[PDB]
Amino acid sequence: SKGEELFTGVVPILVELDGDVNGHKFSVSGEGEGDATYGKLTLKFICTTGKLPVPWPTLVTTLVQCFSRYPDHMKQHDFFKSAMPEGYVQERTISFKDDGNYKTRAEVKFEGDTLVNRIELKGIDFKEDGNILGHKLEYNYNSHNVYITADKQKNGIKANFKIRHNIEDGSVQLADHYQQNTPIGDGPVLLPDNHYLSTQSALSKDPNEKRDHMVLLEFVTAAG
User: What is the C-alpha end-to-end distance of the chain, expressed in Å?
Assistant: First the structure.
């Protein structure tokens, strides 16, 4: 409830990611704005090391659920905002069906009036001619639901969901997400009942940008 105060207006966002997928090292820098009142996020990401070795859609979920719009009757279930300003550690295991997996660790917290997302990504067991390393995924994104449950042992939450990436041949590449969030500070946090986050995402390009990039528009609303 205390952390909610920090999200009453438009909050600047900074994202920094260091990744390694099958030995291919890369870095991504992201900048944008978040408006939790409407569950709206606008972000621009740039691959600072050159060309991204994985498709941009596979990084969308890794690259700030604290900007989710929680309805008034559900505000007591908002773990994400309650952990602020100290923040939370967000860990994920993203299993790509019939392919490799991403293991991510992120520190999400406030640095002044700016919300920061520092991430380390490690990807292993990917097929060289698979949908990921072979860049066979379409530059678009489907709508999904993030199923959340309380993790009272770690004073945090756990989340499970499936992302459906469209392949160029018209098929689907499943990306199973297992999530764990744990608070950084020793302050009080809200431990929720079972609910979900209804998400909708739109991917686009900046016409004047020549570097490998991604413009992300995300709309997230809590329900259930």
Answer: 20
- Quote the tokens at residue 165: 């990436």
- 140, 203 Cβ separation under 8 angstroms: yes
Residue (of 132, 160, 157, 158) closest to 146 by Cα position: 160
User: Please, after which residues is the chain broken with C–N above 2.5 Å?
Assistant: 63
Method of determination is X-ray
At a CB cut-off of 8 Å and minimum separation 6, what does 12 contact?
Answer: 31, 32, 33, 113, 114, 115
Q: Resolution to 1 decimal, in Å?
A: 1.8
In Å, how far from its chain's centre is CA 45? 13
> Where would I find the beta strands (DSSP E) of the chain?
11-21, 24-35, 40-47, 88-96, 101-111, 114-124, 144-151, 156-166, 172-183, 195-204, 213-223
User: Both tokens of residue 186?
Assistant: 């020793």
Tokens encoding 38: 């409407």
Give buried/exposed letters for 48-70 (b at 16+ CB in 10 A, else e).
ebeebbbbbbbbbbbbbbbbbbb
- Within 10 Å of residue 16's Cβ, how many Cβ atoms? 17
Residue extents of the structural domains in the chain = 1-224
CA gap 17, 28 in Å, rounded: 5
Annotate 176-195 with b (16+ C-beta within 10 A) or e (fewer): ebebbbbbeeeeebbbbeeb
Q: How far is CA 108 from each of CA 16, 40, 61, 128, rounded to the nearest angstrom?
A: 11, 17, 14, 32
**Which residue do the tokens 């004073």 mark?**
155
Domain spanning 1-224: which CATH class is it, in words?
A: mainly beta
